[PDB]
Amino acid sequence: SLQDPFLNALRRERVPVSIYLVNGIKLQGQIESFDQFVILLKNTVSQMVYKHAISTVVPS
Amino acid sequence: AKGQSLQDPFLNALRRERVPVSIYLVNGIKLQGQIESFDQFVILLKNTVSQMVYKHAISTVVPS
Amino acid sequence: GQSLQDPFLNALRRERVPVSIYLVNGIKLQGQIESFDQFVILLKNTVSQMVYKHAISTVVPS
Amino acid sequence: SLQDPFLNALRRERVPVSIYLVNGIKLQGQIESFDQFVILLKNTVSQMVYKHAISTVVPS
Amino acid sequence: QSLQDPFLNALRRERVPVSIYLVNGIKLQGQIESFDQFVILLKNTVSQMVYKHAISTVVPS
Amino acid sequence: SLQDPFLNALRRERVPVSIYLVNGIKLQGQIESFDQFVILLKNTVSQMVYKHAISTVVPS
RNA sequence: AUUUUUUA
Ligand SMILES: Nc1ncnc2c1ncn2[C@@H]1O[C@H](COP(=O)(O)OP(=O)(O)O)[C@@H](O)[C@H]1O
Ligand SMILES: Nc1ncnc2c1ncn2[C@@H]1O[C@H](COP(=O)(O)OP(=O)(O)O)[C@@H](O)[C@H]1O
Ligand SMILES: Nc1ncnc2c1ncn2[C@@H]1O[C@H](COP(=O)(O)OP(=O)(O)O)[C@@H](O)[C@H]1O
Ligand SMILES: Nc1ncnc2c1ncn2[C@@H]1O[C@H](COP(=O)(O)OP(=O)(O)O)[C@@H](O)[C@H]1O
Ligand SMILES: [Mg+2]
Ligand SMILES: [Mg+2]
Numbered sequence: 001s002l003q004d005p006f007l008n009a010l011r012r013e014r015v016p017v018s019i020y021l022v023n024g025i026k027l028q029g030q031i032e033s034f035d036q037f038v039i040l041l042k043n044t045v046s047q048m049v050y051k052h053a054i055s056t057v058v059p060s
Numbered sequence: 061a062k063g064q065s066l067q068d069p070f071l072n073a074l075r076r077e078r079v080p081v082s083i084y085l086v087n088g089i090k091l092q093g094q095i096e097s098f099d100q101f102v103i104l105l106k107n108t109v110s111q112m113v114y115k116h117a118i119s120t121v122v123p124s
Numbered sequence: 125g126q127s128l129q130d131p132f133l134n135a136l137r138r139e140r141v142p143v144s145i146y147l148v149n150g151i152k153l154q155g156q157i158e159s160f161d162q163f164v165i166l167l168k169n170t171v172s173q174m175v176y177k178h179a180i181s182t183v184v185p186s
Numbered sequence: 187s188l189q190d191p192f193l194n195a196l197r198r199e200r201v202p203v204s205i206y207l208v209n210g211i212k213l214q215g216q217i218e219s220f221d222q223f224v225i226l227l228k229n230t231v232s233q234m235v236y237k238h239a240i241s242t243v244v245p246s
Numbered sequence: 247q248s249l250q251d252p253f254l255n256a257l258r259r260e261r262v263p264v265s266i267y268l269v270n271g272i273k274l275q276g277q278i279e280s281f282d283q284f285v286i287l288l289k290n291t292v293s294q295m296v297y298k299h300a301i302s303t304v305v306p307s
Numbered sequence: 308s309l310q311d312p313f314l315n316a317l318r319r320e321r322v323p324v325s326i327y328l329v330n331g332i333k334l335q336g337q338i339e340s341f342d343q344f345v346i347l348l349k350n351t352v353s354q355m356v357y358k359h360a361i362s363t364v365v366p367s
Numbered sequence: 368a369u370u371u372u373u374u375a
Contacts, residue, residue, distance in 0.1 A: 002342045003372080006355050021119055022360050023086055024330055035066035037115075037371050047122035048070050050115065051372040053086055055328050055360035059352055067371080085181055087150045099128045101371055111184035112132045114177070115371040117148050129369060147241050149208055161188040162369050171245050174192050178370065179208050179241035189375075207302055209269050221249035223374050233305035234253050236298060237375045239269055250374080268362050270331050282309040284374055292366060295313050298374040300329050300362035344372050359372065 007034050010059060017041075018058045019049060031057075071098050071121070080124040081105075085117050092124055133160045133183065142186040143167075147179050154186060193220050193243070202246040203227075207239050214246060254281050254304070263307040264288075268300050275307060314341050317366065324348075325367045328360050335367055 010017055010031040019027040019041055029043035039049050039057075074081055075095040083091040083105060093107035103113045103121075136143055137157040145153040145167055155169035165175045165183075196203055197217040205213040205227055215229035225235045225243075257264055258278040266274040266288060276290035286296045286304075317324055318338040326334040326348060336350035346356045346364075 002340050002347055003345045003355065006345075006347065020332075021086075022328075022330060023088055023119070024332075025088070025119070027120075033061055033066050035061045036063050038067045038070075040066055040070070045122055047120050048067065049120050050118055051357060052116060052359060053119035054357055054372085055330070055332070056334070056354050056356050058354040064371090086148055087181070089150065089181075091182075097128060099126070099369090099371090101369065102128050102132075104128060104132070109185055110132075111182050112128065113182050114180055116178065117181035118371090127369070147208070149210060149241070151206075151210075151241070153242070159188050163187075163375050164189045164192075166188055166192070172192075173242050173244040174189065175242045176237065176240055176375070178238060178375070207269075209271060209302065211271070211302070213303070219249050221247060221375095223247070224250045224253075226249060226253065231305055233303050234250065235303050236301055238299060238370090239302035240375090247374090268329075270329055270362070272331070272362070274363070280309050282374095284308075285310045285313075287309060287313065294363050294365035295310065296363050297358065297361055299359060301374090357372065 007031055007039065007057070010057070015059050018056075018060065019054055020056045020058065021049075021053050022055050023053075071095060071103070074121070074123070082120075082122050082124045083113060083118055084120040084122075085113075086119050087117075130160070133157055133165065136183070136185070144182075144184050144186045145175055146181045146184075147175075148181045149179075150181075193217055193225065196243070196245065204244045204246050205235060205240055206242045206244065207235075208241050209239075217243075254278060254286070257304070257306065265303075265305050265307045266296060266301055267303040267305075268296075269302050270300075314338060314346070314364070317364070323367045325363075325365050326356060326361055327363045327365075328356075329362050330360075 029041040032040040032042040093105040096104040096106040155167040158166040158168040215227040218226040218228040276288040279287040336348040339347040
């Protein structure tokens with residue numbers, strides 16, 4: 001897996017990310033955690049985002 | 061993390077604590093209600109009535 | 125923590141409940157649940173139409 | 187299965203059908219054949235339609 | 247795959263110009279160079295790899 | 308698999324690529340790596356693109 | 368373990 005090391009590194013270092021959704025919505029926050037099918041993105045609140053809804057995960 | 065170690069406990073906490081949730085769909089529609097039950101593939105969301113939402117249609121689940 | 129799909133659809137079918145099936149593109153279909161399997165739901169209104177589950181957002185009584 | 191008898195009946199009876207795609211396009215023709223993942227729709231030409239792109243198959 | 251594979255293989259072997267409609271309505275054109283379970287390689291000016299999950303319809307042009 | 312050799316050749320030769328997403332957005336960069344589910348695309352940053360959100364990969 | 372990252 002490349003996916004898991006990528007997401008874990010972002011999580012560990014609290015890297016600001018943008019998550020672009022397939023419908024054109026852009027979310028921002030930090031990767032709090034993730035598992036097989038979802039990513040927990042935290043900004044003001046923790047929201048569970050389904051991977052099937054995501055196009056890209058983009059660090060800044 | 062592996063398997064369902066994030067998703068299942070997240071959804072179960074919402075269900076157990078009867079937390080008002082927003083469920084954003086892939087078409088940008090926001091549903092609201094309480095999580096009555098869920099399985100691997102669907103969530104039963106209760107507001108006025110029970111509706112079966114396919115997880116494949118869901119973008120994001122977050123407390124309201 | 126068992127399967128929810130077939131019990132939910134079966135109840136709607138058996139009770140003859142008018143349902144709305146919203147698709148992932150927001151289109152709302154209406155009718156009676158006639159039957160269903162692993163992949164599809166047959167929705168009866170003026171005709172029987174076969175709806176792919178992969179395209180369904182929500183099934184709810186109208 | 188309910189899918190296979192439904193499509194076989196349309197194919198056998200040469201019923202004019204509408205195939206609605208998830209992107210809102212409506213295709214019309216006759217069910218020529220189908221397998222696990224595709225439906226062949228015949229109008230002036232035979233076109234191969236991926237089931238994943240289809241929302242509903244409706245007699246016209 | 248008794249329908250899909252022979253349909254695509256006939257297009258490929260006979261080097262038939264095809265149109266591939268994507269789920270976003272974009273129409274690609276070219277000849278099918280090869281395919282596997284998940285992608286189709288489409289050749290026009292260059293070779294591009296098209297994911298089947300993004301394709302609605304394949305038809306001869 | 309035709310997919311892996313195609314992506315590997317673009318990666319190894321450091322070919323600038325265009326990745327078109329299913330919503331029509333065009334991403335550009337170099338393929339850094341890929342696995343079953345994702346492609347890591349490098350430009351100003353390394354971003355992770357889910358294959359499910361990709362329509363086409365082509366040299367730019 | 369009913370297509371919850373995957374040509375129904
Ligand atoms: N996580 C998400 N997934 C899908 N759509 C979203 C998400 N967040 C917001 N949207 C959609 O983007 C649009 C603008 O969102 P915004 O007004 O910021 O949030 P809200 O409408 O919930 O207060 C709304 O149509 C909303 O449904
Ligand atoms: N659960 C759902 N899934 C997908 N689309 C939905 C859902 N609920 C409503 N919509 C769509 O969102 C748009 C606005 O909804 P709304 O006017 O509230 O419809 P309704 O009156 O049927 O609830 C409509 O196109 C509708 O079909
Ligand atoms: N056989 C088909 N399968 C899927 N989509 C189609 C088909 N034919 C047309 N479309 C879509 O519908 C839109 C308009 O159709 P049409 O007027 O026939 O354009 P064209 O002549 O370029 O196919 C196009 O943007 C195209 O993406
Ligand atoms: N292979 C493709 N897959 C998905 N979308 C595409 C593809 N080719 C073009 N598009 C969409 O159509 C638009 C116009 O096409 P074109 O001008 O050829 O692309 P470009 O943006 O590279 O100039 C693009 O901006 C893109 O949104
Ligand atoms: Mg079960
Ligand atoms: Mg999937």
